[PDB]
């Protein structure tokens, strides 16, 4: 029954690291995707000006930049990691 | 043997929520990344016109926007969540 | 004790597929997000030229494109998948 | 029924933004047409004064021609459309 | 061998797109050169008629000068390149 | 303390880039002002030679007016800012 328990707890560690790396990637993805979204939006404005400094005014009906929010997800994963913590000893 | 079984089933719930949040993030990521890709592509076309309304024609050899498709992934995760469902009772 | 062990190993397979699909999505996300980042940056340069071929010079203080790197994450997940492999038999 | 309410909500959000976009487009056309028409009227005014050099000197204290700007408005509606995007509900949640 | 076949496939996809891009670039140069040359010929025609005002009146029923458009084509090839991108195989799958 | 060191590091990275951006902006203004001023001086030179057509012929062997380029520099600093971005530390790691 030690091999099971040991294999078990050994698997939980592995799992938590998996979700840990995932949450990290998620965090790294929101950052880049958003950083680029801002670069894009800020580019739209710098264009609306120079196409006027010269109708050459942009069509924003199809120039809508979206931002990503993964806080809800990353928190839920953190709960899972924490919950998994609830499965170990007791002899 | 209840603590094990209980710890086990307790861990599965946690796992499924982890993969659930992941699949959600994946869904949220395809949406934003694609939405922005379209905003970018639609911006290219609105530029090819105004650089002609004035060779100022863009170079699309390096202006290729790519779309992301995570359906294969999200489905596989849904299978995993479902499969995990196959490990619980039996006394 | 077979049902437990069987349910266990049955759950590990499911888990590894979950992390496998995740790592795949991560790989698919870095690719698209980066591909689009390059399309965006290359668009900035093609613009700095045509706004000069006509101060209409862009403001790069807010035109900074970022690239995403998930190698650290994807490797850690691969370790988890491998580690999980360490929990199976022994009668 | 959350899905229903949420699907219903996200559904109307789309419509609203489309509505606010259509208003912005509208406002852009108005600024273009009204200003072009003001500018032509202003040019008529300059030509008439010279033409009348044949006093028949027009009174400019009452021929004020205005113009532009709704871009403040344009941008304000543009933000609302963005903040509206931050309101879509994740049915998965 | 899936990896092999897939790697081989993705590999040729790259080459094709590069091929279709090179064709688009080519077609763009042709529209630029042929039109510029048509336009210069057309201007020669207008100058000659005036010059000959010294009948030596040119017959324009047979001096038709055409021009432009391959952008339809340009865009068509541009799509193929995109739909080609939707075909790369995920070796991880 | 890794977090501390890392937070401290990422923190200074921001400042550096801001610094390198401010330098690029600066260099852009200088190219704009110095060239505009060279170009005006050069135009003064062409006008003076004609004006003096009243020998009072200026010696151009010693009136060399230079100009432009810092874009090489501009781009070089622009890269450093990007490579700097590839250095931020993931505190989660």
Curated annotation (Swiss-Prot), chains A, B, C:
Glycans are attached at residues 64, 85. Residues 55-91 are annotated as: Heptad repeat 2. Residues 66-91 form a coiled coil. Residues 1-51 are annotated as: Heptad repeat 1. Acts as a viral fusion peptide which is unmasked following S2 cleavage occurring upon virus endocytosis. This is Spike protein S2'. It comes from Murine coronavirus (strain A59) (MHV-A59). The gene is S.
């Amino acid at each position: 029954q030690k091999m099971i328990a040991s294999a078990f707890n050994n698997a939980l560690g592995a799992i938590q690291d998996g979700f840990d790396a995932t949450n990290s990637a998620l965090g790294k993805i929101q950052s880049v995707v958003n950083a680029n979204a801002e670069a894009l939006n800020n580019l739209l404005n710098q264009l609306s000006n120079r196409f006027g400094a010269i109708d050459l005014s942009l069509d924003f009906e199809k120039l809508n930049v979206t931002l990503l929010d993964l806080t809800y997800e990353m928190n839920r994963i953190q709960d899972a990691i924490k919950k998994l913590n609830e499965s170990y000893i007791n002899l």
